Amino acid sequence: XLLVTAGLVLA
Amino acid sequence: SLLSESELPAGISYAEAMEGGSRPLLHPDNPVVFFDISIGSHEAGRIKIELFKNLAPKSAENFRQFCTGEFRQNQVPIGYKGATFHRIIKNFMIQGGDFVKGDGTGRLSIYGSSFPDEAFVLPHFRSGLLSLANSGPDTNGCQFFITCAKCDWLNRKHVVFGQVLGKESMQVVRKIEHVTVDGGNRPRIPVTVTQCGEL
């Protein structure tokens, strides 16, 4: 996908 | 309390932000900070950023202290000087500010290990907005992203808390956005905040 995480980048 | 793109306050359209200098446009007491950026060993220019203290005071003050060196751990300042952009996705956003680990796992705020989400007032409605990276609800720390396109799917999950000011700022954002990256979207050549502060 197009997220902005800090640790586990998801699709 | 998310505003639609026709309820937006004055001073935050793309055109308005591109006319900005070093003073805030949304509210007169909003701080303006800056990053000087190096791409590899080459100076790329300055990004000036209005922090929306009037809408997201805790988020603005966290970012502001990390720019000025005012936040200390046992008398040792820590913040964005020397921090990198570790995740760069063309046509989406540029992500950085992990001064803890440099890889996207780091989380530290001026309030403790993390701080809660403030109200989600502004949408991710255009390029050039500053928003908090996190790992789910109430996990804000030090990382941030600058939008390189609208990304409203992020609304109500990330607090939009600032905007870049002036055309040079967006030119630098676009330069960072277009550097070569690996399969994990890490730049092949480092992108670093070499200096930062308040204007």
Q: Which two tokens stand for residue B125?
A: 């409605």
User: How crowded is residue B36: how many other Cβ atoms within 10 Å of its Cβ?
Assistant: 17
Contact yes or no for B154 and A3 at CB 8 A: yes
Cβ atoms B163, B136 nearer than 8 A: no
Residue B174 exposure: Cα atoms within 13 Å on the Cβ side? 7
Active site residues of B: 87, 92, 95, 134, 145, 154, 158
Kindly list the domain boundaries of chain B, sorted by start residue. Answer: 14-198
Q: How far apart are CA B75 and CA B99, in angstroms?
A: 17
Q: How far apart are CA B98 and CA B83, in angstroms?
A: 6
Please give the residue of chain A at the shortest CA–CA distance from B93: A4
Residue B178 Cα to chain centre, angstroms: 17
From B92, B104, B184, residue closest to A6, measured CB to CB: B104
Max Cα separation, chain A? Answer: 15
Q: Which two tokens stand for residue B145?
A: 């992203």
Q: How far apart are CA B23 and CA B44, in angstroms?
A: 22
Q: How far apart are CA B24 and CA B17, in angstroms?
A: 9
Domain B14-198 -> CATH class = mainly beta
Method: X-ray
A11 touches chain B (CB under 8 A): no
Cβ atoms B38, B192 nearer than 8 A: yes
Please give the residue of chain B at the shortest CA–CA distance from A3: B154
From A2, A5, A8, residue closest to B92, measured CB to CB: A2
In the 8-state DSSP scheme, what is residue B4?
P
Contact yes or no for A4 and B145 at CB 8 A: yes
Any idea which residue has 């996190």 for tokens? B134
What residues of B are in the A interface, CB distance below 8 Å?
Answer: 87, 89, 92-93, 95, 98, 104-107, 131, 133-136, 139, 141, 143, 145, 151, 153-154, 158, 184-185
H-type helices in B51-186, by residue range?
Answer: 57-68, 167-177
For this experimental structure, what is the resolution in angstroms? 1.2
- Work out whether the CA dihedral B199, B13, B36, B92 comes out positive or negative: positive
- Residue in B106, B112, B110 with CA at minimum distance from that of residue B78: B110
Contact yes or no for B154 and A4 at CB 8 A: yes
For residue B89, give the 3-state DSSP assignment.
Answer: strand
Cβ atoms B91, B148 nearer than 8 A: yes
